[PDB]
Amino acid sequence: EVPWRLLKLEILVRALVHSMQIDFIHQLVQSRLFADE
Amino acid sequence: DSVRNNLRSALTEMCVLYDVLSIVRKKFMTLSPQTLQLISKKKSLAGAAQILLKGAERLTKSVAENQENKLQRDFNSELL
Amino acid sequence: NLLGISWVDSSWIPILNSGSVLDYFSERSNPFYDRTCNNEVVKMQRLTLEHLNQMVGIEYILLHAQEPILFIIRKQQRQSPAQVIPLADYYIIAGVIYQAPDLGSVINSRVLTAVHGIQSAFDEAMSYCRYHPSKEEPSSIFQRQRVDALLIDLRQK
Amino acid sequence: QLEASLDALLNQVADLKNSLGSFIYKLENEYDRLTWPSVLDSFALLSGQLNTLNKVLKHEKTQVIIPLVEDLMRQTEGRVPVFSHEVVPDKPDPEVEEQEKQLTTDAARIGADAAQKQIQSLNKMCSNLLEKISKEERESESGGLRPNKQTFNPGDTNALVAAVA
Amino acid sequence: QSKETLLQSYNKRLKDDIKSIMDNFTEIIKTAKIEDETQVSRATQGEQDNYEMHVRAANIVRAGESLMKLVSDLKQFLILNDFPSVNEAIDQ
């Protein structure tokens, strides 16, 4: 039992160094997971 | 590691100084010139000064040896 | 000595007589003075009778005999007894503090501790570090991509 | 009255050292920091405090004979003995005893006649020679006023510049 | 940002450090201590003052060496790497 939920995400698609911070997106993903609707 | 020991030694020195200041809170009245221990004190001071000068000379000699070898002149030398 | 302590040792003197306190106070220990000073009690002042022993010097005598535990008599190395001015921290006006703590010894200990700390710092900084001469920029579209992400998340939430 | 200034300087140095030790212990991260974060500054401050204390002790000449004065009113304001005894509590001191023994045995704790008296005399002669040389160097260097520099001469060539008339 | 003024400030700092080191060395050289001003503990205060003078001399020497090395590096930067107006090596 104990169904799981997505904790952390990662976007993988211009310049070369695109981005390295998922901070705000990761926090929103965690908030959506804690909502558990 | 050594940071904790240094902090402990500094705290001990500060506590000793605070105790001395509290006991004090040099004074003649109106009503080490011993020539025995001053000799040893001057000898110890000369030894400490010689050790410091020897350390400085060793550092300078290491710097000169590093400058002599034209292979790791990264000290703004190969940069120039 | 026993100024800061409050112990009660009655086994030291087994016979609690009157002369026991005087005998325990008369014994010089370690470097106490003999019966040659002036004004302690009655006995051995000089070719005179000031009192006995409390002139200038270490006044280790029985000025107030307390046979119960030990001879509790202040030094009072002067011409007048019953004065709260001893070498040790001991007062008579309800208990007070004096300048008995040596300032020179404490200052020397502090200087020694400071020298030891400086030596330890030298040993720690010379044998562990250098004592001798020896892409995440937001200027990209991330400057706006981050705002777009924030707006999209605020819309979705 | 010169002891109050030395005591205040010692208290300030102790507070600075305590702040430095707290900053070094809270940010120690279980490692021996040796990159000299404030070690140079702390050593300079310690040397300055020690020099100030030595100067205050050797400033001038102006079994315990305490200062006869109320007498307790100087340290504890109000001259309250009961309050002083109550606030007195709110300790091995083996190094102090060792230093006292070393100073009281023979003033050096090692050797009586086999000391470095000759080495001390040689050091004193060397110090006198160095002081004479330093005084001569100071008297020789005190004559310098200012090292003025020189450059091109545009002021003359300007009036010397050719024109129509 | 005030390159000439920056070099002037560096030179002034180096000169002040050298003067302080020389003055501290001269003060440590005058460590006769012919006055018995210490009335609480003469020998202890004398030994503490001798150790303090030795530590002050050592600290002055260390500060002088550090200032010398730092000024050497700063001059090497501001002169060689910064204003190498003799670019004849480029033409060579």
UniProtKB/Swiss-Prot annotation, chain A:
State the source organism's domain of life.
Eukaryota
Transmembrane residues, as ranges?
A: none
Q: Where in the cell is it found?
A: Nucleus
Q: How does it assemble?
A: Component of the Mediator complex, which is composed of MED1, MED4, MED6, MED7, MED8, MED9, MED10, MED11, MED12, MED13, MED13L, MED14, MED15, MED16, MED17, MED18, MED19, MED20, MED21, MED22, MED23, MED24, MED25, MED26, MED27, MED29, MED30, MED31, CCNC, CDK8 and CDC2L6/CDK11. The MED12, MED13, CCNC and CDK8 subunits form a distinct module termed the CDK8 module. Mediator containing the CDK8 module is less active than Mediator lacking this module in supporting transcriptional activation.
| Cited function | Component of the Mediator complex, a coactivator involved in the regulated transcription of nearly all RNA polymerase II-dependent genes. Mediator functions as a bridge to convey information from gene-specific regulatory proteins to the basal RNA polymerase II transcription machinery. Mediator is recruited to promoters by direct interactions with regulatory proteins and serves as a scaffold for the assembly of a functional preinitiation complex with RNA polymerase II and the general transcription factors.
State the family named in the UniProt similarity comment for this chain: Belongs to the Mediator complex subunit 14 family.
From the Swiss-Prot or TrEMBL record, give the protein name.
Answer: Mediator of RNA polymerase II transcription subunit 14
Gene this protein is translated from: Med14
**Full-sequence portion shown in this chain:** 248 to 292 of 1459
Swiss-Prot record, chain B:
Q: Which domain of life is it from?
A: Eukaryota
Location comes to: Nucleus
The family assignment reads:
Belongs to the Mediator complex subunit 17 family.
So what does this one do?
Component of the Mediator complex, a coactivator involved in the regulated transcription of nearly all RNA polymerase II-dependent genes. Mediator functions as a bridge to convey information from gene-specific regulatory proteins to the basal RNA polymerase II transcription machinery. Mediator is recruited to promoters by direct interactions with regulatory proteins and serves as a scaffold for the assembly of a functional preinitiation complex with RNA polymerase II and the general transcription factors.
Q: How does it assemble?
A: Component of the Mediator complex, which is composed of MED1, MED4, MED6, MED7, MED8, MED9, MED10, MED11, MED12, MED13, MED13L, MED14, MED15, MED16, MED17, MED18, MED19, MED20, MED21, MED22, MED23, MED24, MED25, MED26, MED27, MED29, MED30, MED31, CCNC, CDK8 and CDC2L6/CDK11. The MED12, MED13, CCNC and CDK8 subunits form a distinct module termed the CDK8 module. Mediator containing the CDK8 module is less active than Mediator lacking this module in supporting transcriptional activation.
Full protein name? Mediator of RNA polymerase II transcription subunit 17
Name the gene.
Med17
Identify the segment of the full-length protein shown: 94 to 186 of 649
Swiss-Prot record, chain C:
- Where are the bilayer-spanning segments? none
Q: Does the keyword Glycosyltransferase apply?
A: no
Q: Does the keyword Acetylation apply?
A: yes
Q: Which GO terms describe its molecular function?
A: DNA binding; transcription coactivator activity; transcription coactivator binding; ubiquitin protein ligase activity
Keywords annotated in UniProt: Acetylation, Activator, Isopeptide bond, Nucleus, Transcription, Transcription regulation, Ubl conjugation
State its location(s): Nucleus
Q: Which GO terms describe its biological process?
A: positive regulation of transcription by RNA polymerase II; positive regulation of transcription elongation by RNA polymerase II; positive regulation of transcription initiation by RNA polymerase II; protein ubiquitination; RNA polymerase II preinitiation complex assembly; somatic stem cell population maintenance
UniProt GO cellular component terms: core mediator complex; mediator complex; nucleoplasm; nucleus; ubiquitin ligase complex
Tell me the subunit arrangement: Component of the Mediator complex, which is composed of MED1, MED4, MED6, MED7, MED8, MED9, MED10, MED11, MED12, MED13, MED13L, MED14, MED15, MED16, MED17, MED18, MED19, MED20, MED21, MED22, MED23, MED24, MED25, MED26, MED27, MED29, MED30, MED31, CCNC, CDK8 and CDC2L6/CDK11. The MED12, MED13, CCNC and CDK8 subunits form a distinct module termed the CDK8 module. Mediator containing the CDK8 module is less active than Mediator lacking this module in supporting transcriptional activation.
The similarity annotation says: Belongs to the Mediator complex subunit 6 family.
Q: What is this protein called?
A: Mediator of RNA polymerase II transcription subunit 6
* Whole-protein coverage range: 9 to 187 of 246
UniProtKB/Swiss-Prot annotation, chain E:
Q: Where in the cell is it found?
A: Nucleus
**Membrane-spanning intervals of the chain:** none
Assembly and interactions?
Component of the Mediator complex, which is composed of MED1, MED4, MED6, MED7, MED8, MED9, MED10, MED11, MED12, MED13, MED13L, MED14, MED15, MED16, MED17, MED18, MED19, MED20, MED21, MED22, MED23, MED24, MED25, MED26, MED27, MED29, MED30, MED31, CCNC, CDK8 and CDC2L6/CDK11. The MED12, MED13, CCNC and CDK8 subunits form a distinct module termed the CDK8 module. Mediator containing the CDK8 module is less active than Mediator lacking this module in supporting transcriptional activation.
Q: Which family does it belong to?
A: Belongs to the Mediator complex subunit 22 family.
Q: What this chain does, per the record?
A: Component of the Mediator complex, a coactivator involved in the regulated transcription of nearly all RNA polymerase II-dependent genes. Mediator functions as a bridge to convey information from gene-specific regulatory proteins to the basal RNA polymerase II transcription machinery. Mediator is recruited to promoters by direct interactions with regulatory proteins and serves as a scaffold for the assembly of a functional preinitiation complex with RNA polymerase II and the general transcription factors.
The protein's name in its UniProt record:
Mediator of RNA polymerase II transcription subunit 22
Could you say which residues of the full protein are shown?
9 to 100 of 200
